[PDB]
Amino acid sequence: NTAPVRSSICYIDGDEGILRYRGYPIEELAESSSYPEVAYLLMYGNLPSKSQLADWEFAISQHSAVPQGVLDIIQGMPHDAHPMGVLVCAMSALSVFHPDANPALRGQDLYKSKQLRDKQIVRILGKVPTIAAAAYLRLAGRPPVLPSNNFSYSENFLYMLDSLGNRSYKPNTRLARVLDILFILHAEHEMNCSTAAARHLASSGVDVFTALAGAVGALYGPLHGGANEAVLKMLNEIGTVENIPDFIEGVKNRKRKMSGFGHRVYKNYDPRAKVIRKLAEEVFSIVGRDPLIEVAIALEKAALSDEYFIKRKLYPNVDFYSGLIYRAMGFPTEFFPVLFAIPRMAGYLAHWRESLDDPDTKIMRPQQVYTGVWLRHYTPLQEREDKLGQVAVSNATRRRL
Amino acid sequence: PVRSSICYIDGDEGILRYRGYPIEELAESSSYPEVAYLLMYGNLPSKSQLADWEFAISQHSAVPQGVLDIIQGMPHDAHPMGVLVCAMSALSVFHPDANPALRGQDLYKSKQLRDKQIVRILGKVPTIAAAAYLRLAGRPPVLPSNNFSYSENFLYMLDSLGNRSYKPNTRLARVLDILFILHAEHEMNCSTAAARHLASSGVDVFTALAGAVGALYGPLHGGANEAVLKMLNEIGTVENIPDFIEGVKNRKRKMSGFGHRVYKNYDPRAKVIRKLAEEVFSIVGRDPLIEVAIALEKAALSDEYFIKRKLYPNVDFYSGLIYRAMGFPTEFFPVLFAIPRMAGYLAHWRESLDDPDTKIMRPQQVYTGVWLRHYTPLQERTVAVSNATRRRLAGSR
Amino acid sequence: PVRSSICYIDGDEGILRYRGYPIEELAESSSYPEVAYLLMYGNLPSKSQLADWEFAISQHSAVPQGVLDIIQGMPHDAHPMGVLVCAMSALSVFHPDANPALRGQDLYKSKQLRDKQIVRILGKVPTIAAAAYLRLAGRPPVLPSNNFSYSENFLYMLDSLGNRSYKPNTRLARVLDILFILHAEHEMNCSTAAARHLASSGVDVFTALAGAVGALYGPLHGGANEAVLKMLNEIGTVENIPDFIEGVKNRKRKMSGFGHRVYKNYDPRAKVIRKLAEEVFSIVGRDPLIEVAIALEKAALSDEYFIKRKLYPNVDFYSGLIYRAMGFPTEFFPVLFAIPRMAGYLAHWRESLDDPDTKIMRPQQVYTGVWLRHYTPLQERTVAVSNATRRRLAGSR
Amino acid sequence: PVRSSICYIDGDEGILRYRGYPIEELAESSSYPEVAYLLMYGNLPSKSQLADWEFAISQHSAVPQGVLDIIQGMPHDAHPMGVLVCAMSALSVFHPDANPALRGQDLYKSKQLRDKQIVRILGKVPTIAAAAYLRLAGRPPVLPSNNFSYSENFLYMLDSLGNRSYKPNTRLARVLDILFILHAEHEMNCSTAAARHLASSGVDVFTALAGAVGALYGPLHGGANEAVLKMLNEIGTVENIPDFIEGVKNRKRKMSGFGHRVYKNYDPRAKVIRKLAEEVFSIVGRDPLIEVAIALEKAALSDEYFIKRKLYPNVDFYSGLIYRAMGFPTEFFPVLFAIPRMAGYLAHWRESLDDKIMRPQQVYTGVWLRHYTPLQERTVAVSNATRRRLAGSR
Incomplete structure (x- = not known):
């Protein structure tokens, strides 16, 4: 607490559910807008003109041609890995593949132009979804396919998600729009460790990629x-549902724990849950259902009839339904966190210039208490509790003598 | 609040105390694994203790080879800093037994794995730095050795030319080790702030x-x-110095390389590297930048500027000239500065994982935007420099 | 059935003989190729035979750039057993000259071929058993360096420090050889017959x-x-020893299986190896996996319940223990049962090629299907799990 | 000694049955996947059952992505069956469902695991194996689309010439489908015994x-x-009919491939293969060699010597004639001979998990016991490489 810095992208009160993106409430943007629209709304404050953003969308489209360096660095990675480490490595390589864009070696005055801001933002937005899909389908085995640029951001990702080089493959509107809304719901959260570190990264005048x-x-x-x-x-x-009774009493007497029905940020009224519930029903219509989905539906219906859930504010949260939906698009559990990251960057970038134009943020001296020896003098190793990093030497008796 | 007892800086006197030890006491006779174990646990490494520490450091000096495929991945003219961060990202990926992606949170609580990965990364980083140096010339990379201690083993890595019977010049090895130790750790800085800010937020030590x-x-x-x-x-030339001596006092051209924004009284590091600069001039020779530097050092002190303004030759001057002396290319300094700091990050990260009482809460903020607005469709939207033109626009025109 | 002049097993008594040679005197002071020849050609060979056989098997091993490329990048989602099987399957074609189905109609009936073949195949495995480790930690390939004995070269393939100027250990080779002779020959067992007589007529030897x-x-x-x-x-380490030794009496926590599939009462061989086992115990270091096994073998060989159910740790358990203690992975358990068992099956192959007593097994099937059922055409016919990966089917729509 | 109800060879009369179903009501009124279901379960599928079963077989054909590396990775004069075994041995290190080390107790127990493994085998067999024929042809692998018939799918993937939407001729596909059922399974030849023995041993299906x-x-x-x-x-040339056959009646001229090891009487299979062979004749022509085969067969059918010995040509002769008519390499023939048999393995597999190690007996013939002397006093190979460099240096 004890706010030493300001935030101008949004005002948030999760305990009251007040979402205040640039004065505009969340519900209108969720039910009416799109991802580039909310991106413009957050970065510029106001709402844009078609052209204003037509130009924006067309600028973003003229990207997503990533160097082969990332592609063979991620193909050169073994099949067992984590795809988001793949993201961060390829994005560090993007840091590498654009040495012209760094200000780190041309002084801390190079970044004074608006044109470079526009170019960096548009390049980052164009590049990220292609990299995410490439890592996904590479973990699926299929080599990263090349981008065809005729659809919207979500639908162009869908084509990038799987196309097999086909021109006939057309996007599905329902899943595209519900995925866009889900992106909007996770477009920004109250300042995490990431944003706090990124404000000072901007204060350091380092590459946006980094x-x-x-x-x-x-x-x-x-x-x-x-x-x-x-x-x-x-x-x-x-x-199975038969394991629900002995589970629900398990939380009534506090011998079993339920994960997903409680979250300090929203233990109460949050119509975003209703919005994602309607989107979930639409997704069920468009793709079907899975046994876990049916079990979850039965469990939540029992929970509503149960006083323990409602009285203790244990109502299903956004993460629960959203994860069900990510499963519904046929996405593996391991590929969950990346899907939580593609939108957030937008809001993060919304702070970048916002952090750049705030004079207060600089290099800081953090406060600390040094209880160690104030004055201890060195001693030569002549007159002179732990295993000292005990290394198991059992497979080194034949390969390391 | 966040508090740690890793080290102390006396700003006015320019004193660095790695657990109460003056930095000069270290640089007089210390070894790099010795001071690493010293600061990262707050206690001197004893005979058996230091022996086991250097043993472990020398054992896993070998770096994986997937990261060698990685270094072959990056282009020739690549800046080694991005190369370095990419290399350790790949290394993260290359230690599945050490990541939270499949081992939960307990994995980063046991002391045995903590050390093991600490010494592992301490081995890995200089190997990759040497790989960056050597591939910078396009020359085929080399294998690590194990028959020395840290700095001179790295130098044996640096100069083999395909001959595995090389050796480190002990004077050069010692001066390089002191160069590493001088920039070991400063009390909490912006990079260190980000370091422990990431560290306490349950992420994989690698990346x-x-x-x-x-x-x-x-x-x-x-x-x-x-x-x-x-x-x-x-x-x-030296002839340009006198008028430039006036010129810097004319406020038209500024002078950096003299003093410190946090140390003023002194920085014993400047004195010790002055001694080592005399030694390196003796042991390698003189070059035009060297005598122009020493001439500036002698001349600028005589002028009343630094007498009244107070700007005492900063470690930067001697460090840069020594880097030029050691055959280091111009662009290779930042990774060299990166090599020492890893000890500080490792110490801070281990300490942060040590104490669960220290937390990073969610900071408050005061909104500076409008309190209320509303959405209208766009059709009615009443009415830039996003893309560069005259290059593809003219091409299509 | 098959005629046995090769080796006999008294599974219910506990004596094994390589052509009427008891295991004790033979295995104490013999060598791997000596045993190979003696099993192969009946009566024991001479020094000239020793020189010819050893020199040929040493010279006929190296593979230039063959099946190694089928590995060194391929995923390892299981034990290298499949890796080695694929490796020798590809070795079956990297030298098509070693094939009888492509010239005339049969070629192993030629003594010179069969001889050169058997020499190579007895000596060919080392070069790829080298890669058996090359894709679990990732060191670059090292030359086979065919200038030593069988086990000496084979362990140099693992112990070379990536160096062309390292000398492999010899006592490890001796242990490997004695254990090979320990697991040298068994009579018909799981697939052991199913291979031999299948290659009696057959089409190849690698397959x-x-x-x-x-x-x-x-x-x-x-x-x-x-x-x-x-x-x-x-x-x-020691604290769970009473727990397990009481649970095994109470059947709650015990082992998997002891003895052989035909041997259950007595085996005098491994006992002396067990003694050499403790020679291993003080040279290859210590870790919780071995000291516990010491007390298990001490207890589970003379305690009450174990002698009730004849539960003493089998020869396979001791072999795996000694090998994993050598410096081998926790998984290289079956890749090495191949080395002497192959030689046993090569001897079986030659013998079965000699005696024409390899007969196909007649069927005694129990046909429960009806002797006649009428037409049930699909057109007049009227309407498994069929569970599939159907993550998305509306994408194309 | 193997006891099973999978099939019944009746050599003297020629009455074969698939779970009780004879060829006479199958080769003209059934499909190969339908018989596959029957032999999996011992009963006829229904039209909805057949629909879901064919859907299951078709849908899962995901070849692992490494095989492209292997196929273009060995000496290029390799044996076709050798390339087959290399490719599928490479497969053996890909799918982690076939590791008895991982599944300590639950290897192949649930019916889900059973049928999932069955389809995981069947779907990608030619793509793993028969797609290697393109390499000897010299063309890159063509990815299959499981919206055709399974035999049509095989003909599509092997014969496409480089077209995305090629249509295989839907006349030969029925013949290729039937050819499986014609020579699907036969008891205890050499390797079915190996399959039952290894399934008794309790191992994975890949190796x-x-x-x-x-x-x-x-x-x-x-x-x-x-x-x-x-x-x-x-x-x-055919004009060598009489002089040769009398020489055969003189027992002086070599012959091969007549009668059968386990069959020696009439077979309707002979009639159906003759009809299929002449149909493939009519649709894709011949060479004079096929006419030579026809002439020698018509000579054998009217020679008294063969009638005395009850001699009729084996099914493999007409199978080779048919495989040559469709213009496939003769040494490529074993590929066109291995596809059906594995099917009868799978049911065997299943049935082998329903009812052991089975070590056979033997007779010891060597010396019983003797003393051993160390190698030093063991004084007094079989080839010495006559082209000796030392003999070429001394």
Whole structure:
């Protein structure tokens, strides 16, 4: 707490559900707008003109031709890995593949032009979805396919998601729009470790690639991502509906724990849950259902009839339904966290110039308490508790003598 | 609040205390693994302790080879800093037993794995730095050795020319080790702030640091030496010095390379590297930048500017001239500055994982935007420099 | 049935003989190719035979750039057993000159071919058994360097420090050879017959060996260390010894399987090897997997319940222990049962090629299907799990 | 001693049945996947059952992406069956469902695991194996589309010439489908015993079928009809009918591939293969060599010597004639001979998990016991490489 810095992209009150993107509330943007629209709304404050953003969309389209360096660096990676590490490595390579764009060696005055801001933002937006899809389908085995640029951001990703080089493959509107809305819902969150580090990365005058590298690497940790897979495996191992009674009493007497029905940010009224529920029903119509989906539906219906869930504010959260939806698009659990990151960068970039134009943010001296020896003098190693990093020497008796 | 007891700086007196030890006491006789274990645990490494520490450091000196495929991946003219961060990102990926993606949170709580990965990354980083140096010339890379300690083993890595019977010049090895130790750790800085800010937020130590080191890419300190280098180069002959001595006092041209924004009284590091600069001039010779540098050092002190303004030759001057002496290319300084800082990040990261009582709460903010607006469709939207033109626009025109 | 002049097993008594030669005197002071020849050609060879056989098998091993490329980048989602099976399957074609189905109609009936073939195949495995480790930690390929004995070269393929100027250890080779002779020959067993007589007429020799080793991979049908890997874990160092030794009496926590598939009472060979085992115990270091096994073997050979059910750790358990202690991975358990078992099956191949007593097995099937059922045409016919990967079907729509 | 109800060879009369279903009501009123379902389950599928079963077989054909690396990675004069075994041995290190080390107890227990593995085998067999024929042809692999018939799918993937939407002729596909059922399974030849023994051993299916196909090429069931091809050359022109056959009646002129090891009487299979052979004649022509085969067969059908010995040509002869009519390499023939047999393995597989190790007996013939002397006093190979460099240096 004790706010030393300001935020101008949005005002948020999760305990009251007040979402205030540039004064505009969340619901209108969710039900009416699109991802580039909310991106413009957050970065510029106002709402844009068709042309204003037509130009924006066409600028973003004229990108996504990533060097072969990332492609063979991710094909040169073994089949067992984590795809988001693939993202961060390819994006560090993007840092490498654009040495002309860095200000780190041409002084801290190089970044004073608006044109370079526009170019960096448009390049990052064009490049990220292609890289995400390439990592996805490379983990699926199929080599990263090349981009065809005739669809919207979500639908161009869908073509990038799987096309097999086909021209006939057309996007599905329903899943595209629900995925766009889900992107909007996770377009920004109250300042995480990533944004806090990124404001000072901007204060350091370093490449935007590297700054968002630090941001996404902050997003890597299971502090953020360790919810969706946890809830998915909760539902998987709870299994059949017959295991629901002995489970629900298990939370009534506090011998079993439910993950996904509680979140401090929203333990109460949040119509975004209703929005994603309607989108979930549409997704069920467009693709079908899975046994875990039916089990979750039965569990939530029992929960509504149960006083323990409502009284303790244990109502299903956004992460629960959203993860069900990511499963519904046939996405593996391992590829969950990346889907939570593609939109957030937008809001992160919305702070970049916002952090650049704020004079207060600079290089800082953090405060600390040094209780160590104030004055201890060195001693030669002549007159002179732990295993000292005990290395198991059992496979080194034949390969290392 | 966030608090740690890793080290102390006396700003007025310019004192560095790695657990109460003056930095000069270290640089007089210390070894790199010795001071690494010293600061990262707050206690001196004893005979058995230091022996086991250097043993472990020398054992896993071998770096994986997937990262060698990686270094072959990056182009010839690539800046080694991005090369370095990419290399450790690939290394992260290349240690599945050490990542939180498949081992939960307990994996980063046991002391045995903590150390193991600490010494692992401490081995890996200089190997990749040497690979970057050597591939920078396009020459085929080399294997690591294990029959020495840290700095001179790295130098044995640096100079083999295909001959595995080389050896390190002990004077050169010692001076390089002192060069590494001088920039070991400063009390909490912006890069260090990002370091432990990531660290306590449950992320994989690998790429973890990857960033913290990319934080130095900025010209906060990664371009400071280039400034003094280019100014001394553009000055030229000694004849240009006197008028430029007036010129700097005329406020038309600034002077960096003299003093410190956090140390003033002194920085014993400047004295010790002055001694080592005399030694390196003795052991390698003289070059035109060297005598112009020493002439500036002798002349600028006589002028009343530094007498009244107070600007005492900063470690930057001697570090840059020594780097020029050691055959280091101009662009290779920042990774060299990166090599020492890894010890500080490792110590801070281990300490941060040590104490669960320290938390990074969600900071408050005060909105500076409008309190209420509303959405209208766009059709009625009443009515840039996004894409460069005259290149493809003219091509299509 | 088959005529046995090669080796006999008294499974219910406990004496094994390589052509009427008891295991004791033979295995104590013999060599791997000596045993190979003696099994191969009846009466024991002479020094000239020794020189010819050893020189030929040493010279006929190296492979320039063959099946190595089929590995060194391919994923490892299981044990290298499949890797080695694929490796020798490709070796079956990298030298098509070693094939009888492409010239005339039969060629192993030629003594010179059969001889050169058998020499190579007995000596060909080392070069790819080298790659058996080359794709689990990732060191670059090293030359076979065919200038030593069988086990000496084979362990140099693992112990070379990536260096062309390293001398392999010899006592490790001696241990490997004695253990090879320990697991040298068994009579018909899981697929062991199913390969031999199948190559009696057959079409090739590589394919039969690959099929046999592939059929001998599972945790308990010829291997015994894959299963007991977990029963050796989670039992601490000394504190869980009473717990496990009481649970095994109470049947709650015990081992997987002991003895052989025909041997269950007595085996005098491994006992002396067990003594040499403790010679290993003080030279290859210590780790929780071995000291616990020491007390297990001490207890589970004379305690009450074990002698009730004749549960003493089998020869496979000791072999896996000694090998994993050598410096081998926790998985190289079956790749080495191949080395002497192959030689046994080569001797079986020659013998079965000699005696014409390899007959196909007649059927005694129980046909429960009806003797006649009428037409059931689909057109007049009126309407499994069929569960499929159907992640998305509306994408194309 | 093997006891099973999969099939019944009746050599003296010629009454074969698939779970009780004879060829006479199958080769003209059924499809190969339908018989596959029958032999999996011992009962006829229904039209909806057939629909879901064919959907399941078709949908799953995801070849692993490494095989492209292997196929263009060995000496290029490799043996076709050798390329087959290399490719599928490479497959053996791809799918982690076939590791008995991982599944300690649950290897092949659930019906889900069973049928999933069955389809995982069947779907990608030719793509893994028969697509290597393109390499000897010299063309890159063509990805299959499982919207055609399975035999049509095979003909599409092998014969496409480089077109995305090629249409295989939907007349030969029925013949290729029937050819499987004609010579689907036969008991205890050499390798079915190996398959049942290894399935008793309780192993995975990948290495099992790899060893099985490697052992199939035994030139008593692998050289099914190669040898007679050489005979089809020594006749030359048809005018060598009488003089040759009397020489055969003199027992002085070589012959091959007549009768059968387990069959010696009439077979409706002979009639159906004759009809299929003449139909493939009519649709894709011949060479004079096929006419030579026809002439020698018509000579054998009217010669008293063969009638005395109840001699009729084996099915493999007409199978080779048909495979030559469709213009495929003769040494490529074993590929066109290994596809159906594995099917009867799978049911065997399933049935082998329903009812052991089965070590056979033997007789010891060598010396019983003798003393051993160390190698030093063991004083007093079989080839010495006559082209000796030392002998060329001394």
